[PDB]
């Protein structure tokens, strides 16, 4: 199995809210589809139903927070455990040059529905940018993604 810290759980609660935009406590196929399409993906209704099905333990058709936590607590089955984090980084690093620019970060924040002013987005870059080049490389991304 696995065990999550209270901090990790709180972080996942915030992530959950980006899917559950109406705040009703559940993620519907429509809500999951909306986020994925905003990020450039194109899941079919059948695929969305399958994704929901995987974690929909009670089978009520939607994903609630407890089920979301299980998703985030499942251990990786892919031999190389870091690909998931590298793939996430590539979503932010739009032009794939290895560094997330403020422009690229603003775009992903907007796509995810994370409403932030340009100034707030610069504060994110500043927190992650340890070497001071004004952008965020993979290593810096890893560090700000760490729960502790």
């Amino acid at each position: 199995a696995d065990q999550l810290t209270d901090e990790q759980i709180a972080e996942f609660k915030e992530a959950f809210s980006l899917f559950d935009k109406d705040g009703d406590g559940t993620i519907t196929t429509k809500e999951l589809g909306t986020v994925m399409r905003s990020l450039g993906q194109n899941p079919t209704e059948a695929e969305l139903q399958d994704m929901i099905n995987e974690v929909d333990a009670d089978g009520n058709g939607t994903i609630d927070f407890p089920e979301f936590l299980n998703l985030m607590a499942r251990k990786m089955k892919d031999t190389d455990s870091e690909e998931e984090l590298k793939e996430a980084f590539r979503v932010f690093d739009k032009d794939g040059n290895g560094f997330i620019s403020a422009a690229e970060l603003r775009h992903v924040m907007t796509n995810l529905g994370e409403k932030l002013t340009d100034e707030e987005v610069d504060e994110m870059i500043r927190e992650a940018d340890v070497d001071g080049d004004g952008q965020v490389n993979y290593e810096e991304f890893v560090q700000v993604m760490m729960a502790k």
Partner: peptide, 20 residues
């Protein structure tokens, strides 16, 4: 870090729910 974790984990959640 919450802004990075909130968004980064949302991206990761999608990755786990879907195949690559």
């Amino acid at each position: 870090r919450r802004k990075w974790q909130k968004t980064g984990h949302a991206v990761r959640a999608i990755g786990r729910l879907s195949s690559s």
